[PDB]
């Protein structure tokens, strides 16, 4: 909690060009015309098993 | 625009749309110099940038009437004696080189299928 305050006070003192230059996320369409900024986090569940139903990729692959 | 109707109709779980389609596939080679006919029906039912068939593709999209649609497919190959080639054939693009239709069924868990 200490260091996040640290993080977010210098975060306002960026120039605001600078701050286009950092930026977390990537823009990715979750529906019919419907376009997100989205964080990506892996993940491996060994317990679970189920068949895959709703996705939004095919290929499973980095692309 | 024969090959994304179908796709699209063995993806979303068609059965009265893709008999249409295949029977369309029938009247469209018989018409032809009849030379390489079986390099001709394999052209149409595998998209050419990655090698994925049509029977792949409806096993990665797990449908209430998969089990149907597999047997329509598997029942066409047959009489066009290409069920060889169809059932054995891979992925070609770097990524996932090797990959086959029975690949696909037993990591979606399908025990009937398999």
Known sequence: LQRARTILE???MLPEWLRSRFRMGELCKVADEDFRLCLRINEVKWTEWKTHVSFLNEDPGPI | RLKKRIFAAVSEGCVEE???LLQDLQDLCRRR???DVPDFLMHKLT???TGKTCLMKALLNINPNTKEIVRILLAFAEENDILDRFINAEYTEEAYEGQTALN???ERRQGDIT
């Open chain 1, 10 to 12: 210098f975060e306002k």
């Open chain 2, 18 to 20: 893709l008999r249409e």
């Open chain 2, 33 to 35: 110099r009849g030379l």
């Open chain 2, 47 to 49: 998209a050419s940038d």
């Open chain 2, 104 to 106: 696909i069924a037993i």
